Every structure is written in C-alpha cells, then in structure tokens.
Amino acid sequence: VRRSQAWFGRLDRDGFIYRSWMKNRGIPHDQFDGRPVIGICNTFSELTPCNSHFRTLAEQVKIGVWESGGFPLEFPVMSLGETMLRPTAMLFRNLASMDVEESIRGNPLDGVVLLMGCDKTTPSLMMGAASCDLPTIGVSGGPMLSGKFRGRELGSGTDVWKMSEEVRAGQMSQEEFFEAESCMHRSHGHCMTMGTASTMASMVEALGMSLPGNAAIPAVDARRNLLARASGRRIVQMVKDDLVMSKILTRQAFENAIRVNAAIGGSTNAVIHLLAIAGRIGVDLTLADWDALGHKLPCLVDLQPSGTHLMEDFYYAGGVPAVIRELGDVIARDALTVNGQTLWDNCKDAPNWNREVIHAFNEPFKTEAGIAVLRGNLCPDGAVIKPSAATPALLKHKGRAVVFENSEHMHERMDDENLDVDENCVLVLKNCGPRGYPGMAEAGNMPLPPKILRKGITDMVRVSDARMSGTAYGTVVLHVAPEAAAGGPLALVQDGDIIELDVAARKLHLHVSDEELARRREAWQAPPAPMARGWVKLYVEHVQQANLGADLDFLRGKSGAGIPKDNH
Amino acid sequence: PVRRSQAWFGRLDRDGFIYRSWMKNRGIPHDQFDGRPVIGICNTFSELTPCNSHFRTLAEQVKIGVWESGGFPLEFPVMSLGETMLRPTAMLFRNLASMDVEESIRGNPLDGVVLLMGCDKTTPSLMMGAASCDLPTIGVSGGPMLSGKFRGRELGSGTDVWKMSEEVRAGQMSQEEFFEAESCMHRSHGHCMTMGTASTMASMVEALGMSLPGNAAIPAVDARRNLLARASGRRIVQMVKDDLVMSKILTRQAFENAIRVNAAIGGSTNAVIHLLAIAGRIGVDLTLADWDALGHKLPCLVDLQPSGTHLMEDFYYAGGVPAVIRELGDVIARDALTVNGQTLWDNCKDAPNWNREVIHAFNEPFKTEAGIAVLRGNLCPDGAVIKPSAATPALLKHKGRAVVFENSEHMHERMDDENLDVDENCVLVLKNCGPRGYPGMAEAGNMPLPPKILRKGITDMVRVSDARMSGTAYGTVVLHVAPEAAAGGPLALVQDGDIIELDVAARKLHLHVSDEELARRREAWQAPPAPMARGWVKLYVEHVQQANLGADLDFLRGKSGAGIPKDNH
Ligand code: FES
Ligand code: FES
Ligand SMILES: [Mn+2]
C-alpha cells in the first residue's frame, strides 16, 4: 500500500538497515508501523533572507503531522535567495528542482510538504514534486510587513527602483537612499509587494496546491503558523486518500491561476514558472494560454508595482480568496484543491473588508490589465509585457533602437552623458536570456538614462530577452524568444532600427527587411560558453527558451515515485 | 578579489541596497557588512539522514566560533545524503549534491566556508564541490555514534548486520534476535560506529589536513565535538584573512598521507573512489595505482571492526587518528600543511596513545601488508580494488570455478537456490552494478554467500564484481572492477564455469578464457538500456565516469575558482 513500507516494513536483512539507523536519536518503533511518512522540504537558509524563519514553519508542520498520526521528516535542498544568488537565482532554479525530485523519490516518503517563499524557491519545489507526483501540499512562507520610513511606507523592490531612479535623476540624496535599508525590510518573510514571491504564493493557492488563505497572510502573523500546522494535518489525510498532484494540477487549475494572476496584477515571472510546472506535471500549456485567458480580465488589487497598497493591506482586505470570489463567472468552479474541496467552494463566501484594495469586478482597479503576449518578427516565439504597471501612452509607440549588446555594455554605456537618446527611443538589451546572462537575470527594467530622468519622466519602451522582477514597473517587453544568444532575431537589432509596439495588436515589429536581417544573421556568431565546466555548462547547453519555462530539456516530464532497488 | 563578499555588501550603488536590505530583515547590525569575513556554513542536517540529525546544534557551534572572531556566519542547505535511506543508492546522488555546494558558494557572498559532513556520501559531495571553488575551507565531521549495547555485549554498525544476517540464513540466530538488536545497535547521534566509510572519510579529512587535529574520532554526543565545531568557526575567519585556500592544503603530499593513514586505520574501499573525485576537482595527479604503491604494504595499526574487534569509541579514547599519524612518523610527508597553520607532524608529533590494544604501535602492527590493493588483469583492465584488512589469507591467492549473476536481481534469486552447483572454492561474479549498471554503484559487492556453504561454518569465499562495498563489510571481495559490465568491460563476458585466478601478492585478477573467445563473446554483448529516459539519473548514466576516476560526472571535473559573478539585477 504505502511506498514507505518498502523501507520501514521489510522483515529481512534490509528492514533492519532502513529502521536501525532511524532509531539512533530515539524514534518509537510504532512510527514505522505503516502510517504516512511525510517529507518536509525545508528551504530554510540564512542566505535566503525571505525563508530565514522556515525553522519555525517546519516545526508547525511537524506538529500537524504528529497530531494526525503521521511520521514527519524534514530534509534540505538548495535554497535560492533572489537578492544574493549571482549571476541570478534563475540560473539555479533547475538545480534545486533536481534536489527536490531525487530527495522525494529516493526517500521513503508517502506525502510531501513544500516550504516555499522566496521568489525562485516556489517553482524549484513545485517542479521537482510534480515529477514524483505524490500527495503534495504547499506551505508558502508569507510576505514581510509593509516597510516603514519617515512616516511613509516602503515597497519591496518597487521602492528600490523608484528611489534609485530618483537619486540617479538627482532629485533624492544618496544618503536618504541608504538610510532605508534596515527600514524597508523589517520582520521576517518574502517581498511585501505584488512581486514574484507573492504571485507564486497566489499561484500555489490558485492552482489548488495549498489551503485557502495560504498566499497573503504575513510571515510573522499567527495565522501563518496555523495554516502550516493545519496543512501538516491535511497532508496526512491526502496520503490516505492518495490525493496526488495529478488530481489538482489539471488544465482547469492552470487556467484558474492565469485568471487570478491577471486579477492580482501578477509578476511577469509567474508566466515562466507556470510553464515549467506544467512541463513536468504533463499539462499542455503555452504562452497563448496566458494571452487568451489573461489580458481580457481586469486587475482588481490596488498593490504595487501596479497600485499603491502592499501585501499587508491585501491580506486584511481578504487576500486571494476575495480575489477568486470576484472572478466567479470565469473561474473553473469545480476545480479541486488540496484540502478536498473545489476552488470555488473555498472562496464563494470569502469576505471583502476593504474595496479600495480589492475592487469589485464590475468596478475594477485597472481595466484589461492582464499580462499580454506579443508576436512578430522580433519575438517569433513570444514576448510578455505587464500593462498593469506600464504607461498607457507608451502601450502604442514607435521609436528608434538604442542598442546595448549585453549587460556589461549596457552598464558601460547607459550613464554616458554623450549618448544620443531621448524619451521616445526604444532601449534594446541583448544576451541576457537563459544562455545569455547566463540564467536570464532580472535586467529588463533598465534604469532610464540620466538625461531623461532630469527631464521629469520615469518610463521608456524597453525590450529585452531577459526577465525583470515582479517588483518592477514600466513598459518592459521581456522573455523575447528566441533569446539573442540562441540566434533569435533580437540578436540583430542595431542602433537606429525602428521598433513599433502595439500591445493592443500583440505587435512587436522590427522595421527592417527580411533580406537585411539575413546578412546580419550571417556575421552573427553565438557567444562563447561562459564556463565549459560545472553546472553552468550543463545549463547553457541544455536549458530551453523562456517561452517553454526555461527548464532543462532532460528534466521535462514526470517519472512518478516507484520503489527502486535495495541499496545493498 | 580580496574580500569577494564586498562585491555584494560593500557596494555604494543601487545593487548595494538590494544585497543588504533583505539580509537585515531579521535584525542584523550594519557592521556585519563590514567587509569582515563572511563564513558560509554548509549544513547537511536532515531527519532523513539520521547521522546528520544533530547538525543544527553543530551549525550553531560553528557560528559561535565565527562570532567570537568578528566574522559573519551564514548557514545554507544542500541536498543531504543518508546512506540507509536513499535508494537505489546514495552514491548515485553524490555528484548532484556536489553541484549544490559548489554553486551555493560561488553565487553567494562567501569569503570562507565551513563544511558540516557526517554520513557517508556527505563528506565527498561537500569536499568535491568545495574543491571546485578553492576558497578558505574548513571541514567539520559529525562524529561516530556511541557503541551499540545489546545483551551485555557490543554491536558494530554495519559489520554486525552482515554477520548476524549471515547467522540467521546459516541457521544459528533467531529471526527475531536480529530485529531486537535493531534499536540497541544505534542509540546515539552520529555516523557508523565502525571504521566504515563515514569514519574513514572523517579520518581522510583530518589526514588530508582539511580539519583541525582530532576531528575524525570524536563521538557525536561527546562534548569535544561541539568544541571543535566552535574552534573551526574561530579558525576559518582567520584563514580568510590569511587566504588559506584548499589547493594550498589539498596537495599531493596530503593525498599521499591520506592513502597512508587509510592503510593504518584499515579504512574503507570507498575512500579510494571519493579521494580520486576530490583530487579530480582540486587538480592533483592521483591515480588508482598510487593507492597500492603508497598504501598496500603499510601495516594496519587499528584494531577496529570490520578489520578488528573494537569500535570508534575506543578509537577516540586511544588518541584517534593523531595517534595513528604519530606511529606513521617515518612514512608520512611530515611537512604537509594543515588548516590550523601547522604541518601535520606539528599537530601529531606529541599525540598520546592511551591504548596500544586498539591503536597498535608501528613495530607491533595489528596486521602487516594490510593496505587496500589494486588489481590488474584481463578482467579489470582499468583496475580493481580489494581490502585485505578484512579478507581471509588462504583465499588471498585462490583460483576456482565461476558462478555468475548477470545483474543483482538475478543474484537475489539464484544465490539461495539449493539447486546451484557451487562449493566454497568457486568465485562469485556479479555484473551490472557499477556507476551505470545499477544505476549508481550500490554496495552489493559483499554478496551474501550460498546458504549451503554457510551451514559449513564457512563465512568467506572470494567474490568479484563491478559494484561497491560497505566500509563496514569484510571478506575477500574484489571490487570497483573497471570498466563496469554495463560500460562494456570484460566482466560482462564472464560465464558460468570460467576459472578466475586471484593473487593479491601478484596483483593479478585473471580470467582463464582465451583472448579470442572474449572478443567473440563481446559480439553478442549489447549494453543495458538506460534506467530512465528522464531526470537526473538519465544525465547521470550518460555522464558518470568509471570507478577508476572517482565516478564523477565528466563535465563536473576540475575547478572554476570563485571569481565575482555578474550582478543579478
Ligand atoms: S527577495 Fe526573496 S522575495 Fe524578493
Ligand atoms: S549510515 Fe551514515 S554512516 Fe553508514
Ligand atoms: Mn556507504
């Protein structure tokens, strides 16, 4: 029955081996009796500031299992801290997924609890677990408290760009900027805006992989530990009911996630990770699904980078349950969630305590504010833009290309005061995709050249093959596929070329002949391998493009959780 | 870079905000981004690796020592490897965790690292990926657990599992007396209480100069262990300022000393594969033939299971491996540098021996000519290892009929079949259990003997395979046969009947079959299919190297330093 009994139930020479060592620290023999063993994937790390409190979170989950008669065991994987990993945390997104997948199948686990929070750590565990497909429940770590500074509030990342552009413009002092370090981010948890970590927590509960309310409650709130403990209870039942990830991660679950991602003004990185998760659970989902389901919908939460308020205000207003309830005419209602009820039955009666934060559907915060997927000769395989946090007057715009051949050249050249750029140009950035950076870093939201900032404007049309943080704003076209370092038509844009953007027409058209690109394409040579050694060589030579999830090619798909050979 | 962490923390731009504000979300003084040595502590704690269960208190011990010396301690996780839990074997996952530790050190602002390593595969996976960075690195072993206490006698980790199970199937031990010693064999924190792999690698780390003196043998629940993790936290901060990097410690002299110490302690056969992988990352010429050259003829000075009688607890109380290195005064590279800052002799030249019964003197060796021996012949063209420290002398030179098992499932079913034509003089042959055949190199070399033979009081008969063995195992077991049968090696061609000659004195493993018959047999040989068309295992089979080179992935060999990577925003 249980697969853990292939370890703990054997009455042979091997059963001694799988049991005698586990009893070295005092574990009662009844723990190996056949009750569900629960693996707790602990991404706790002091190098992951947003998950640094996951020791407590695991213990609450551990209590939950003991309450319900299960055998809980926590294990580690590589944790990813978006603020500290370099060249970028996305570079190691796939490496952590192999830790999760192999640690789950290789160990006597019947159920899985995922402690995820910090940006990249949410897809790392969701992707590795989907390839084993045991009864799995996700516990999100929770956001930080809203920043506090001089009687004002500070936003995670969103106020980092706004204040660094304000000092680059010369309108704010550099001393005031660095005085906000300890004042922006107090308290435990992940980014306090509607950035990647917050949307991915919403994606976890929009897909149905968590108990209701899991996304929005802050990390130091008491209900954070309640939900972790309550999910430690539920996962025991799910093992008995065999509620595997296959039954939750249906196509209707991904559509629902896309629907609420546009309703919350979600990160542009949710688009990439959701494709990678679908790529391993075995659900056909392309970028076109995001456009067909997303842009038509309005954005209903008034949170940065799209709005004003923060994740603290968002939870007190009702959180994701209140947002799903308002998508009641478009959500796949009978889509089951991890607690044994459909998504609509967990949110049909969710309250709303503040409509200035969570708007009514019939009176939304921003109309047609869902993410758009652009097509054209410059992005033949797709490119995304987030109009919720973009300038409307720039959504239909045409300008000359100011090209930055890579990120180094972009930093060597952006601050050049004798650069020929005005507000109406189109800043282009190349060689920052999966093979480009390497790792597809959040470099899309380029800081505007200082000459433009002093003029008094903070937005210009920027196109790139890189990502940007969910914390970021502006009119930024991202995930241009194929990337420049792959041979994509982005690699051939030169200074002076005219790029026209019409997000209403899904247009990213490069004004240049089909015959002129072909001579440029002949002189173009792919950049050299950045390491030719270690994980990075494996990454650049195996990672797929941004339009498919930026996953390693041999990691796509599932493999289940069979009972492997005995180890001796 | 002088203080590579200042590329994050000492930045006076926008990015400098990103790298500091987030770290300060739990209350960290701004002066921790001083430029003081930031010390990454790679914690392999997990409840699914019962031998690293106490590492949360170990990691805290390390931090204390870092805080004393004005450093910045940060712990971070990587995939942990519990050998008893991970199937089909924890070896298959060593190189994966090797990538975790390496990328976590290069991508994070770390001036120095502390390695918390206890269970078997947790030492190499941590040492390898650290060697690929060549940063100021200190290793901290978790310690062996207390001896097993059962019915007023002692139980040995791993060793007594083989010997009690071989007594159940021989019909002399209750099927329940086996399972009642279950909770009595392991009753404290730590790794295997024998001279298995986990204690050998702990002895390797200290003999390689990669740890403070006395690091190997300290039991986990003994208080000197926490003191050591605290002392290593003190020491690593000063090494960052001295820029004492791994390549300055892990030189050839260190590896040569490690081969010597492994022989005198009766170390595991698995230490051979892992040091070769460690050398392959750090960039030091070390070949399988070096192990026999430097180590075989050296005497075994340690009277521990599976070679002797006592347990790791006694080994610490007699002076640990420092007392062994002292008895090795006339063979070791005396002037090899260790982590504290003094040569290996200055750390051990006055090491006291409190018990000449478990740590013998050199001139009173427990066993002569007891180092691991590599073999050469038609059967193992790239080398095969054997541990005579736990073998039987009469079968050290032996020839007999072959009884073959095409894979391991075939063995689990044919070995017990009483209709099998085999006596105690036949050579047992097991195929398709090496890096690619199993997959991973599981410890199936110590094959259970035919139940017919065990009823004669026979405990040992010669057994060859391309598999590995438990460091706690024994017998005249030829191991690590390279190339493995799955990779096309000659072992795949052994057939029910061929005579196989063993002579470790001559280092000869010869299969008495014509050379032409073999190439004619290899006509009908077709490689086994990959176990998985997907996942890490697929990458593993198509990139793992053989046991002669350390079983690393080919694209993971060598080092890449630890230069400053590009900004992440
Ligand atoms: S830094 Fe962890 S959530 Fe953005
Ligand atoms: S089980 Fe960890 S030492 Fe053998
Ligand atoms: Mn082992």
TrEMBL record, chain A:
Residue intervals of the Dihydroxy-acid/6-phosphogluconate dehydratase N-terminal domain: 35-346
Binding site for Mg(2+): E82, D119, K120, E442
Gene3D superfamilies (alphabetical): IlvD/EDD C-terminal domain-like (3.50.30.80)
One GO molecular-function entry: hydro-lyase activity
Matches recorded under Pfam families: ILV_EDD_C (PF24877), ILVD_EDD_N (PF00920)
Source species taxonomy: Bacteria, Pseudomonadati, Pseudomonadota, Betaproteobacteria, Burkholderiales
Origin: domain of life: Bacteria
Binding positions for Mn(2+) per the UniProt entry: E82, D119, K120, E442
UniProt record similarity statement: Belongs to the IlvD/Edd family.
Source species: Paralcaligenes ureilyticus
Residues bound to [2Fe-2S] cluster: W21, C50, C118, D119, C191
Domain Dihydroxy-acid/6-phosphogluconate dehydratase C-terminal: 356-550
Full protein name: Dihydroxyacid dehydratase
Entry keyword set: 2Fe-2S, Iron, Iron-sulfur, Lyase, Metal-binding
Sites bearing N6-carboxylysine, chain numbering: K120
